Amino acid sequence: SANEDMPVEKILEAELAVEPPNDPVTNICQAADKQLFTLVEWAKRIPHFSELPLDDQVILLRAGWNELLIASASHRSIAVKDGILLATGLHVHRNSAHSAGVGAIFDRVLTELVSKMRDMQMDKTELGCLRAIVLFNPDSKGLSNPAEVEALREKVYASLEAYCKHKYPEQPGRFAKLLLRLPALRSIGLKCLEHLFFFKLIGDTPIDTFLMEMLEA
Amino acid sequence: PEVGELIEKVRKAHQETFPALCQLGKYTTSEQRVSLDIDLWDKFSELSTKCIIKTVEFAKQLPGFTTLTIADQITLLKAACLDILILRICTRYTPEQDTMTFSDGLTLNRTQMHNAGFGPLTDLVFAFANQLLPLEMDDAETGLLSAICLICGDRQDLEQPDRVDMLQEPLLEALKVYVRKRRPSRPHMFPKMLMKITDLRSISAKGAERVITLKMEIPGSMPPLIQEMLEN
Numbered sequence A: 001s002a003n004e005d006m007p008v009e010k011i012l013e014a015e016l017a018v019e020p021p022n023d024p025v026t027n028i029c030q031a032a033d034k035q036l037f038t039l040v041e042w043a044k045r046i047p048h049f050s051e052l053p054l055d056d057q058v059i060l061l062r063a064g065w066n067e068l069l070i071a072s073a074s075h076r077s078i079a080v081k082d083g084i085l086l087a088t089g090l091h092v093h094r095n096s097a098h099s100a101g102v103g104a105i106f107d108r109v110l111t112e113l114v115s116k117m118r119d120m121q122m123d124k125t126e127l128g129c130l131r132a133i134v135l136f137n138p139d140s141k142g143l144s145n146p147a148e149v150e151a152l153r154e155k156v157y158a159s160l161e162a163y164c165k166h167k168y169p170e171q172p173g174r175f176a177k178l179l180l181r182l183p184a185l186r187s188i189g190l191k192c193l194e195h196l197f198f199f200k201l202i203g204d205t206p207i208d209t210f211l212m213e214m215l216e217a
Numbered sequence B: 001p002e003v004g005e006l007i008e009k010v011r012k013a014h015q016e017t018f019p020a021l022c023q024l025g026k027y028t029t030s031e032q033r034v035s036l037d038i039d040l041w042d043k044f045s046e047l048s049t050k051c052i053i054k055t056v057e058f059a060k061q062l063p064g065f066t067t068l069t070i071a072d073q074i075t076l077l078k079a080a081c082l083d084i085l086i087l088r089i090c091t092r093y094t095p096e097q098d099t100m101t102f103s104d105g106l107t108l109n110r111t112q113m114h115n116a117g118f119g120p121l122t123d124l125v126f127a128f129a130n131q132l133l134p135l136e137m138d139d140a141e142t143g144l145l146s147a148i149c150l151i152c153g154d155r156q157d158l159e160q161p162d163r164v165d166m167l168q169e170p171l172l173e174a175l176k177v178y179v180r181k182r183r184p185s186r187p188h189m190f191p192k193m194l195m196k197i198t199d200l201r202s203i204s205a206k207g208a209e210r211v212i213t214l215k216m217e218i219p220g221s222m223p224p225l226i227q228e229m230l231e232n
C-alpha cells in the first residue's frame, strides 16, 4: 500500500497543475515571484499536506521554497543548453548570470542539477517526489509535530522507490541516484540565499508573511 | 556476494582509520563559553590534522579510489574532509555526558568543544550528532556513508566525473542492503541515513567559513596538506 499512502500520480498532478524591463536580476525576480505565487497551490495538492496544522504548513514552505523553485527550474532546463529556462519562458545564459554576480551558483545548478537530471532522464514524477521530500522537512524550526512531517517524508520515500522499481526495474540504484540530488540542491539553495540582498522577491514583502496570507485565504 | 566483500572491505578501512567510541579509554582537560581557548585549540587543531591524515589513508583503502586520476583523488579529498571529520567526531558522542571523544581518547564536553573551536557552530554540530543516534549506525555504515560522501561525482574540477559516479554506485547498493538487512522492519532507514549527507553538507559549509576566520585570528593556523600528502 506504499503508493496508497503517497500516490505518485497525485504528486505528479501537483507538479503539472502548477506547471508554468529585461535584465538578469529582473528576469530571475519575476520568474521567482511567479512561481512563489503558485507554490501554495502546488503544496496544497501534495497528499496530506493540507491536513497538517496550518502554522506548520507555513514553516515547511518558508524553509524549502528556494530549493523547491531551483528544483523545478533545473528540471525544466534539461532541454535547453548552457542556461536556465525561467518559469517566464525566458532563457538565461550563464554569461547573463556572471553578469549579475550569480555566475558561480549558476554553473553549479547547471552541472550538479540540470545536467544530472538530464543524464539520468529524471521524469516529471520523480522530480515531483523529490520536491515533496523537500517539502516535508522534519528538521524545519518551530514545527508543531515534526514526527508527523517526518512520517510523511518517509511515505514519499516509500512511494518514490516503489515507483522506481516499477518503471525502471533494470536500475536497482535509481532511487539512490535520485536522492543524491537533494544534498546538492541544499548546497546550491543555501548559496542562493546570500544573493537575496540583490534579488528582491515579492516586492520585498517578507516571505513568511506573504506565505501566511496565501495559506490563510 | 561481491557486495559483502565491499562492505567488509569498507568496514575494515574505517575500523582501521577510526577507533570506535566503545573501545577508547577516555581522559580530559570550572569553565564557561568564551571566544576561544587557544590551548584547547592547539590540541584540537592537532587531533584534526591527524584525523585528516587518517581520512586520507581511509580513502586510499577504498576500492578503486587510488585507480583515479591523482587530481581527482585530491579534489574529492579536499571537498569531503570537513564532511568526514564532522561525521566522524559526531559518531563519538556520548549523550548522557553530552561529550565528544577524540581518536586519542580526549573527551570534551559542549563548552570545551565550543571553546576549542566549534564556536558558533557548536550547538549545530551537537544537534547533528544527536540526530545520528536513532540511526544506531555501526562501523560498516559509518564507513560507507563516509565513502559515499567522499566519492561524489558532483564536485567541480573533476577530470573524470563519470568514473567517480561509477565508483559510488556499488557503495549505495551495499549501504542499501546492509542497512535494511540490519533493520528488517524499517526500510526507510536507508534513505534516512543517506539523506544525512544533506545536513552534513550544510554544516561543513559553515564549517569552512569558520575555518577562514580562524586561519586569520590564529597565525599559521591549519597549513594545507591533502594535496601534498596525497602526492607523496
Ligand SMILES: CC1(C)CCC(c2cnc3ccccc3c2)c2cc(C(=O)Nc3ccc(C(=O)O)cc3)ccc21
Pocket (backbone or CB within 6 Å): B044, B045, B046, B047, B048, B049, B051, B052, B082, B085, B086, B087, B088, B089, B090, B101, B102, B103, B104, B117, B118, B119, B121, B206, B207, B208, B210, B211, B221, B222, B223
Ligand atoms: C568548527 C570547525 C569547522 C573549526 C575547524 C576545524 C578544523 C578543520 N580542519 C583542520 C585541519 C588542520 C588543523 C586544524 C583544523 C581544524 C573543525 C574540525 C572538526 C572535526 O570534527 N575534526 C576532527 C574529527 C575527528 C578527530 C579525532 O577523532 O581525533 C579530531 C578532529 C569539526 C568542526 C570544525
Ligand SMILES: CCCCCCCC/C=C\CCCCCCCC(=O)O
Pocket (backbone or CB within 6 Å): A028, A031, A032, A033, A035, A065, A066, A067, A069, A070, A072, A073, A084, A085, A086, A087, A088, A102, A105, A106, A109, A192, A193, A195, A196, A199
Ligand atoms: C530560487 C530563487 C532564488 C533567486 C535568488 C538567487 C539568485 C539567482 C541564482 C540562480 C537562479 C536559479 C533560477 C531560479 C528561478 C526560480 C523561478 C523559475 O522557476 O523560473
